[PDB]
Amino acid sequence: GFRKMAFPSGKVEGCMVQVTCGTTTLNGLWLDDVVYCPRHVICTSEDMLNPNYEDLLIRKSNHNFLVQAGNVQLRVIGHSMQNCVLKLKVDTANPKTPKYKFVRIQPGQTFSVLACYNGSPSGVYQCAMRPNFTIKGSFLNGSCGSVGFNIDYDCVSFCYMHHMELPTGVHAGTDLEGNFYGPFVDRQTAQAAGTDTTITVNVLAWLYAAVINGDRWFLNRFTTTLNDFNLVAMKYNYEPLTQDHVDILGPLSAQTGIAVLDMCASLKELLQNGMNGRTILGSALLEDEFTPFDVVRQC
Amino acid sequence: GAMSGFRKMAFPSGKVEGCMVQVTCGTTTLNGLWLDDVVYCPRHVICTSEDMLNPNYEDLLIRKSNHNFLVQAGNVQLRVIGHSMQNCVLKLKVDTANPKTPKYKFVRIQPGQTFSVLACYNGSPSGVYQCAMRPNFTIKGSFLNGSCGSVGFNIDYDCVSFCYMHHMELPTGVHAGTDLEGNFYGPFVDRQTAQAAGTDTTITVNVLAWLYAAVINGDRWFLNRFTTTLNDFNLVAMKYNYEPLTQDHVDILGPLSAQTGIAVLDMCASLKELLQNGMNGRTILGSALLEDEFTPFDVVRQCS
Ligand SMILES: O[C@H]1C[C@H]2CC[C@@H](C1)N2Cc1ccccc1
Numbered sequence A: 001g002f003r004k005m006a007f008p009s010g011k012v013e014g015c016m017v018q019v020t021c022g023t024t025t026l027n028g029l030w031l032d033d034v035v036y037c038p039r040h041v042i043c044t045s046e047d048m049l050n051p052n053y054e055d056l057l058i059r060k061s062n063h064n065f066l067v068q069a070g071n072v073q074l075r076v077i078g079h080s081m082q083n084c085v086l087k088l089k090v091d092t093a094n095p096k097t098p099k100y101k102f103v104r105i106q107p108g109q110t111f112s113v114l115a116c117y118n119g120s121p122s123g124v125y126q127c128a129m130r131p132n133f134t135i136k137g138s139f140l141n142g143s144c145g146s147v148g149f150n151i152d153y154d155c156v157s158f159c160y161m162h163h164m165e166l167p168t169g170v171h172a173g174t175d176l177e178g179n180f181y182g183p184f185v186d187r188q189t190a191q192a193a194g195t196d197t198t199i200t201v202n203v204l205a206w207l208y209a210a211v212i213n214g215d216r217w218f219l220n221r222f223t224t225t226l227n228d229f230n231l232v233a234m235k236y237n238y239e240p241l242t243q244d245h246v247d248i249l250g251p252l253s254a255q256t257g258i259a260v261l262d263m264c265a266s267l268k269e270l271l272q273n274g275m276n277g278r279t280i281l282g283s284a285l286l287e288d289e290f291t292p293f294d295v296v297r298q299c
Numbered sequence B: 001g002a003m004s005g006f007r008k009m010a011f012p013s014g015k016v017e018g019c020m021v022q023v024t025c026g027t028t029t030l031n032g033l034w035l036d037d038v039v040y041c042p043r044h045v046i047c048t049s050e051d052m053l054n055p056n057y058e059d060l061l062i063r064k065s066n067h068n069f070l071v072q073a074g075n076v077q078l079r080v081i082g083h084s085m086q087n088c089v090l091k092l093k094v095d096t097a098n099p100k101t102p103k104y105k106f107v108r109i110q111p112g113q114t115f116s117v118l119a120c121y122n123g124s125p126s127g128v129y130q131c132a133m134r135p136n137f138t139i140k141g142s143f144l145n146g147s148c149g150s151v152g153f154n155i156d157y158d159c160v161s162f163c164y165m166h167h168m169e170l171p172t173g174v175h176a177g178t179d180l181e182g183n184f185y186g187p188f189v190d191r192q193t194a195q196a197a198g199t200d201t202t203i204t205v206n207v208l209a210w211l212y213a214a215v216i217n218g219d220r221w222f223l224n225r226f227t228t229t230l231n232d233f234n235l236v237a238m239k240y241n242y243e244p245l246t247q248d249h250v251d252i253l254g255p256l257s258a259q260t261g262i263a264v265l266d267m268c269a270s271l272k273e274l275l276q277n278g279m280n281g282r283t284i285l286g287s288a289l290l291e292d293e294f295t296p297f298d299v300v301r302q303c304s
């Protein structure tokens, strides 16, 4: 048994609020007496072509910002900008503020997203940062202002905020400090996600998860070099394996007795020959949205 | 379009997290669902490992008193004031009503319907996932054996419809459980005996709703211009371990058929061709697999 789960979203639900600036309405993250939201809420329909956000911001009054928490409206008493997130100083601290951090993740790492609309949570799903720096998801997977997070024993690590949905069924955003993931801008302009690749380090972790649960038909007696595998994996649009990734898989290699370059040879043959009608953990396709720690932590 | 690259989402688990408690009977410990002044949990918490082969739950329960049960919610102990058995769920009455109690109902679901499960170990929520109710009356979940007492639920307008409680691991790695009234789904007993779930099939009505969702989003590569009779389709689908489509299922897909202009039996012929050819690289709504855990109810509502 092995099914992908998202973190319990209870701690994040208590922070979701509705932020409206003029005609634009989106989701905001209410922590203490500050509401975090994408800065493009201050954009006009007619001005999100090359906006000069800080000049538009220093002239919008606090009363332009409508903040709703359920049926309580929070009075905005201040506003400042950090990169691409808008900070709204409000007169009320959120009593449901959890123990939290602001962290930045890197491609291949996983987190949960609390999909929200008009500040009210609709659903939660588990996802990974694609190598192209996008997050797979539809317009029905949350609108602007939805946040991505991890939970580490009572502490919520906020790592992502939805900013825009790309036409290819993926969305892109920033961390909670305003820094985009990937080569994207918060402008209505022609933006496309680059050619996506498979997160190789996650596939091996998922293959380790199959070993730990007794699915070991794919294990072979061969070993490969790190680059001979990388030369093959890249040909199949699999994100190259670094020595960092080999190190992160260390505990799974020691616990299963399968060296990383041993499992790499198994994955290598899987790429060149397919699975030949067989399955792994009940799936006929290789899963790449399970980090090594996701496996260490569930298995 | 609207649903491009769509991902299955579980319902926000906040309202259920506030109900999870830890129930302990002697050395056995598992999860309980605290609603008002009643804690619901699997009745096999009163079993030891030796009792589980042939447990006499009436004999075991009649020997228990309120002080034999330890119920903990975070750091507070809940004194039990009453205990009764309803089928396969234990109901422990406590002196404290759950102030965190959400709006809730008890509902029994059918195979094919979907819900969220909050996986909990010793009363603490670990993770949440979205699953469907398999035709063989199991669910494919992920555990550690402590997940007994984890509940399945849906949320509609902040009212939490509880529909499942986990009881068993079956030897095939899937899970079996009851509704919140204690009635098992399928031919399973809360007994650690030789139980085998019948071979699982694919929820055909969910796949057809998934394919209708793709057409609404402009994903039409899999469509063919053929139609089929309902019997000819069922004759083919069952050989691929797909569920026989009933006239009820055809009626449920009505609004989807009318919204796209593709007859249900026409869609069935396209699915029949997908089964003989496979996808093998091509994707539908961004997924390289035929999704069978998204119900027509969810498709119709998200595509008005
Ligand atoms: O944006 C994604 C992450 C990185 C950068 C480009 C591509 C896609 N990745 C590298 C790569 C190249 C060849 C083969 C496999 C991976």
Ligand SMILES: O[C@H]1C[C@H]2CC[C@@H](C1)N2Cc1ccccc1
Binding pocket: B135, B136, B137, B198, B199, B200, B201, B237, B238, B239, B241, B242, B243, B244
């Ligand atoms: O328990 C599940 C529901 C029903 C009855 C057994 C099986 C699985 N289903 C029938 C069936 C079998 C093969 C092919 C198509 C349908």
